[PDB]
Amino acid sequence: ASNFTQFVLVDNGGTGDVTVAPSNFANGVAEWISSNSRSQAYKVTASVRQSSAQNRKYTIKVEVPKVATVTVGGVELPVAAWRSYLNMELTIPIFATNSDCELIVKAMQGLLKDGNPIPSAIAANSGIY
Amino acid sequence: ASNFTQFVLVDNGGTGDVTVAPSNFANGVAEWISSNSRSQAYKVTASVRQSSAQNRKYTIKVEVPKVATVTVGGVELPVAAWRSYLNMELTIPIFATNSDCELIVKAMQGLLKDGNPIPSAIAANSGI
Amino acid sequence: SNFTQFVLVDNGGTGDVTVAPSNFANGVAEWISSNSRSQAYKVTASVRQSSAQNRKYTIKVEVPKVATVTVGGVELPVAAWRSYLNMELTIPIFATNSDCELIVKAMQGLLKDGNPIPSAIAANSGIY
Amino acid sequence: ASNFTQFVLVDNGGTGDVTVAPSNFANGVAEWISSNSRSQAYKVTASVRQSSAQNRKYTIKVEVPKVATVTVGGVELPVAAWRSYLNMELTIPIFATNSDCELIVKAMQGLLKDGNPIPSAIAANSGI
């Protein structure tokens, strides 16, 4: 609907941010991309449908590559080394009010704050516990 | 260890917070809970794999219910009307330094800011 | 709150056929006529957001032709053949209530008792 | 011939009904339109084929626009704000008799009755 706009995925505080802008929405798959390249842009995909008699399911996927620069001859061609994926699902009952939805969003926000254990474990390349 | 501690899940900016505390670690699955009730507490679950060749697959689950107080006679049973589940997966290749993982976490944090499209779409309960 | 039963074929009384709710999983509503597997009329429906301003409702129907072949003495009921039916229906998101009743009225009056298309289907002949 | 005639599509139960009249037949496709306006008329399309030596197949399409008038300069251009499409397919085995086709048409009539779950779900514009 009116939520198909652009936003900053990575925020480095200044000119280092990475903005994704709307690209496509067909077959029920919203697709934001960073740049019109094929293998160098951060990619965000989203969709929503009804899953059960009383639930809805929103599914979200993110792809974050690592970019390098390998030169053959003297062309200086930029390339992608590897990609890191993400698959987020979210089941929400139909008759949930608005405040319940901000509660869910607040839970997801606070789970990934800087000082929390799970993001620190992800960032330090260690194991849980 | 120091990563298996307690933390605030829902931050109400003060006294109204919700805090989850370590409960269990079994079968590779670490589990935080809020209170000791079976239908009254927020639940958090985390685990990590290191599959054979080149992967590191974190998985995270959250459970957030809505609470009501159905009554029979005068028992006053505290019950959960419905639970809003949640999943998450995160594949990272082994050739990832510390800064690359920091960048991945920064992207995954910034996806869920206040004024971004996806959190608003979730907050509205309608089409994207 | 639209997951109820209804009359598929209405012979005005004794000969009617009713379908009652059976299942709803993976986003597929499923009505069946009886707990069998080959002698039941079947209805399947689902809805999603297809495009930026559209929604897609898809509906499928299955209608068999039952027979009563006998082997020994146990009088098997079988299905000789099945006639299928698909239906897609793209409706813009911001269509009003009157607009959608107009859409339903058009899609319903297409199949009146004496129009070209239903007559051609019934007579087992072709258009024109 | 005997099936390429005109018929009423939307029946407003009075003076507001909409009629479609034969327009074209080409490549096996028969096409009815309501008026001659290039982008303002209800459209109906039908065709039949015998793919294999085993079964028939009918395909039907409907286009319903939302009328509106936009003025640029002083021209008063009539346009369609949005069009709601509609598809339909119906596979019938060759050796189905006439009564079987009557039954299929009656089932497809009863699915879209006045107070059944599917037309109401369409008229509400939400989940089924």
From TrEMBL, chain A:
Acts as a translational repressor of viral replicase synthesis late in infection. This latter function is the result of capsid protein interaction with an RNA hairpin which contains the replicase ribosome-binding site. This is Capsid protein. Keywords: Capsid protein, RNA-binding, T=3 icosahedral capsid protein, Translation regulation, Virion. It comes from Emesvirus zinderi. Homodimer. The capsid proteins form dimers that assemble by group of 5. Twelve such pentamers are linked together with free dimers. The homodimers binds to the viral RNA via an operator hairpin, but also to many other RNA sequences in the viral genome; this interaction probably shifts the virus from the replicative to the assembly phase and ensures specific encapsidation of the viral genome. The gene is cp. The keyword RNA-binding applies. The keyword Plastid does not apply. It is found in: Virion. One of its GO terms (cellular component) is T=3 icosahedral viral capsid. It comes from the Viruses. GO terms for molecular function: RNA binding; structural molecule activity. Belongs to the Leviviricetes capsid protein family. InterPro entries: Levivir_coat (IPR002703), Phage_RNA-type_capsid (IPR015954). Pfam families: Levi_coat (PF01819).
Automatic annotation (TrEMBL), chains B, D:
It comes from Emesvirus zinderi. Transmembrane segments: none annotated. It is found in: Virion. The keyword RNA-binding applies. One of its GO terms (molecular function) is RNA binding. Belongs to the Leviviricetes capsid protein family. Keywords: Capsid protein, RNA-binding, T=3 icosahedral capsid protein, Translation regulation, Virion. Acts as a translational repressor of viral replicase synthesis late in infection. This latter function is the result of capsid protein interaction with an RNA hairpin which contains the replicase ribosome-binding site. Capsid protein self-assembles to form an icosahedral capsid with a T=3 symmetry, about 26 nm in diameter, and consisting of 89 capsid proteins dimers (178 capsid proteins). Involved in viral genome encapsidation through the interaction between a capsid protein dimer and the multiple packaging signals present in the RNA genome. The capsid also contains 1 copy of the A2 maturation protein. The lineage of its organism: Viruses, Riboviria, Orthornavirae, Lenarviricota, Leviviricetes. It holds the Pfam family Levi_coat. Homodimer. The capsid proteins form dimers that assemble by group of 5. Twelve such pentamers are linked together with free dimers. The homodimers binds to the viral RNA via an operator hairpin, but also to many other RNA sequences in the viral genome; this interaction probably shifts the virus from the replicative to the assembly phase and ensures specific encapsidation of the viral genome. GO terms for cellular component: T=3 icosahedral viral capsid. The keyword RNA-binding applies. This is Capsid protein.
Automatic annotation (TrEMBL), chain C:
InterPro entries: Levivir_coat, Phage_RNA-type_capsid. GO terms for molecular function: RNA binding; structural molecule activity. It is found in: Virion. One of its GO terms (cellular component) is T=3 icosahedral viral capsid. Keywords: Capsid protein, RNA-binding, T=3 icosahedral capsid protein, Translation regulation, Virion. Acts as a translational repressor of viral replicase synthesis late in infection. This latter function is the result of capsid protein interaction with an RNA hairpin which contains the replicase ribosome-binding site. Capsid protein self-assembles to form an icosahedral capsid with a T=3 symmetry, about 26 nm in diameter, and consisting of 89 capsid proteins dimers (178 capsid proteins). Involved in viral genome encapsidation through the interaction between a capsid protein dimer and the multiple packaging signals present in the RNA genome. The capsid also contains 1 copy of the A2 maturation protein. Belongs to the Leviviricetes capsid protein family. Homodimer. The capsid proteins form dimers that assemble by group of 5. Twelve such pentamers are linked together with free dimers. The homodimers binds to the viral RNA via an operator hairpin, but also to many other RNA sequences in the viral genome; this interaction probably shifts the virus from the replicative to the assembly phase and ensures specific encapsidation of the viral genome. This is Capsid protein. It comes from Emesvirus zinderi. The lineage of its organism: Viruses, Riboviria, Orthornavirae, Lenarviricota, Leviviricetes. The gene is cp.
